[PDB]
C-alpha cells in the first residue's frame, strides 16, 4: 500500500512537471486559458500531494 501511494504521489509530481512544461509553452503561445489551467491544476495537486 505504501508503494502504491508513492507511485500515486510520483504520478501527481509528474503531472505537475508536465503542467509546468505546458505553462512554458503557454507563455510563448500567449494564450491566457492554457496558463490559467496549469496554475489551477498545480495548486490542487500540491494540496493533494501534501495530503498524500
Amino acid at each position: 500500500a505504501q508503494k502504491r501511494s508513492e507511485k500515486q504521489y510520483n504520478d501527481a509530481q509528474n503531472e505537475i512537471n508536465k503542467w509546468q512544461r505546458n505553462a512554458q509553452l503557454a507563455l510563448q503561445k500567449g494564450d491566457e486559458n492554457l496558463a490559467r489551467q496549469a496554475l489551477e491544476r498545480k495548486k490542487t495537486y500540491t494540496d493533494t500531494s501534501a495530503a498524500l
Binding site: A23, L27, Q28, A35, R36, L39
Partner: peptide, 11 residues
C-alpha cells in the same frame, strides 16, 4: 492569478 498570467503572457 490573472496578474501573474499577464506577466507570463508578455513573453
Amino acid at each position: 492569478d490573472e496578474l501573474a498570467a499577464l506577466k507570463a503572457q508578455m513573453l
